Design a protein around this ligand. Structure first.
Ligand SMILES: COC(=O)[C@@H]1[C@H](O)[C@H](C)[C@H](O)[C@H](C)/C=C\C=C(/C)C(=O)Nc2c(C)c(OC(C)=O)c3c(c(OC)c(C)c(O)c3c2O)C(=O)/C(C)=C/[C@@](C)(O)[C@H](O)[C@@H](C)[C@H]1O
Ligand code: HEM
Length: 378
């Protein structure tokens, strides 16, 4: 009977739309009308959302679900494993999961802390004020995906706007990665893309997969680095605790993932009738889910609307859940674990260069949430 609330509070940009807590505490699963007229369901409770994401009877195909954020299509792009179901998804997942484990991703930790070091150096020499996104938040995960895939160092400039060129199309990236894949076959190296030439993926799938990680691996990470930096500098008591015991960095990253929930909303479709939250999801119904409302669910988190890096543990749904749970989540953890304490160790008095109310937020219906830039100075 109700639509999806998407409007934030004007001076509370880190927090979910207020209308979600009213629908959730009324009912963690409720009826929802989608932008195209589909009468479906909205899941806001943490337990209900988690059951939605883990059940094998739910589909993420774009020809099965309805998009809850706006009215709209597309073809399942080559290398898009997120909007396909098992066993098609499973083939990607087994091929890739053992390559993204936390063991193999810590083994890029030094590369991460040198990428961060290089950009922290460029920030200082340029001087403040500057845009953190252009200078740090976007470069750092861009070069991490490059270092993960074995992009040649002389080639990385083409992939992000000059720290101070026209943004490559999704077709440009493919034509480049075709060229790069062919070079990896004749000369493999110690990187993910070299290993994957000997796999079952066609040229189309693997090339498409590379172009997806260049966007999927950057956008949400960059906005986490931006929003989390913005949140940490407002809370110098949090910074002092991270400064004192720096091993709180791991807890601090998780709590920021839970607080921000940049991938704020999604939906799945019922492949079959599924009983969920005491009530039956008809087959063919879409169940939209709010990650951000589930990460502020007081059923799961005490004082959930409070940012506190001391408690930050796992259980949040910021990386998703189930079979589609973020493949790059251990890589992203290594980046933020290195980047957040490194920023403030180098710039302890880092702070916004404009009033917080002047920070340009991304549109309510965009995925992921975040900022278009973040002027900072020190
Ligand atoms: C072109 O879409 C956009 O411009 C997005 C934007 O929100 C606009 C305003 C709008 O919503 C969109 C047009 C409308 C309907 C979208 C529908 C039905 C859909 O299927 N959604 C998507 C699509 C198409 C995705 O992309 C792939 C290839 O699967 C991804 C995705 C993710 O990373 C693993 C997600 C965590 C994720 O959740 C989604 C997602 O939900 C990616 O792999 C990449 C590469 C994502 C991205 C960096 O490119 C941006 O996040 C990107 C998705 C967004 O900027
Ligand atoms: C803070 C950083 C990140 C966040 C918040 C994030 C968020 C997410 C979320 C929520 C999903 C699941 C969406 C759903 O279930 O509908 C997802 C899936 C995915 N992410 Fe990310 N992500 C991050 C970093 C990365 C990185 C760095 C990479 C690449 C190296 C990556 C690649 C992927 C892939 C491939 C999937 C699909 C996995 C599958 O379908 O099995 N992500 N991400």
């Amino acid at each position: 009977p109700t639509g999806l609330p998407t409007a934030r509070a004007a001076g509370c940009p880190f927090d979910p739309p207020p209308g979600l807590a009213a629908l959730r505490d009324r009912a963690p699963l409720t009826r929802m009308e989608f932008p195209n007229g589909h009468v479906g369901w909205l899941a806001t409770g943490h337990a209900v959302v988690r059951a939605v994401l883990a059940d094998p009877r739910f589909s993420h195909r774009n020809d099965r679900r309805h998009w809850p954020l706006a009215d709209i299509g597309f073809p399942p792009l080559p290398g898009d494993m997120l909007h396909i179901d098992p066993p098609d998804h499973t083939r990607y997942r087994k091929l890739l999961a053992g390559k993204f484990t936390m063991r193999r991703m810590r083994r890029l930790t030094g590369s991460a802390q040198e990428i961060v070091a290089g950009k922290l150096d460029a920030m200082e020499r340029h001087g403040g004020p500057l845009d953190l996104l252009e200078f740090f938040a976007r470069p750092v995960p861009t070069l991490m995906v490059c270092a993960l895939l074995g992009v040649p160092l002389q080639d990385r400039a083409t992939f992000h706007p000059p720290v101070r060129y026209v943004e490559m199309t999704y077709a440009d990236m493919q034509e480049y990665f075709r060229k790069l894949v062919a070079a990896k076959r004749a000369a493999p190296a110690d990187d993910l893309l070299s290993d994957l030439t000997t796999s079952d993926l066609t040229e189309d799938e693997l090339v498409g997969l590379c172009a997806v990680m260049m966007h999927a691996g950057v956008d949400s990470t960059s906005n986490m680095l931006a929003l989390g930096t913005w949140a940490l500098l407002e809370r110098p008591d949090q910074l002092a605790a991270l400064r004192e015991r720096p091993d709180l960095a791991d807890r601090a990253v998780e709590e920021l993932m839970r607080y921000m929930s940049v991938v704020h909303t999604g939906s799945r479709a019922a492949l079959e009738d599924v009983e969920l939250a005491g009530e039956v999801v008809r087959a063919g119904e879409s169940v939209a889910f709010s990650v951000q409302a589930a990460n502020r669910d007081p059923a799961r988190f005490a004082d959930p609307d409070t940012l506190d890096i001391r408690r930050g543990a796992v259980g949040h749904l910021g990386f998703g859940y189930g079979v589609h749970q973020c493949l790059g989540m251990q890589l992203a953890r290594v980046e933020m674990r290195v980047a957040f304490p490194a920023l403030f160790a180098r710039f302890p008095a880092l702070r916004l260069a404009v009033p917080a109310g002047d920070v340009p937020m991304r549109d309510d219906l965009v995925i992921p949430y975040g900022v278009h830039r973040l002027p900072v100075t020190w």
